């Protein structure tokens with residue numbers, strides 16, 4: 001008899017790598033990108 005109060009009203013989007021809490025979703029999904037090993041034209045041209 002543990003039924004009753006239930007609702008996914010409160011939502012929180014917390015990254016995985018950095019584990020930073022955000023406000024919206026689109027903000028996170030896109031952010032996650034930042035975590036991509038291998039960036040061309042970064043530290044040195046070649």
Ligand SMILES: [Zn+2]
Nearest residue numbers: 015017018019
């Ligand atoms: Zn992150």
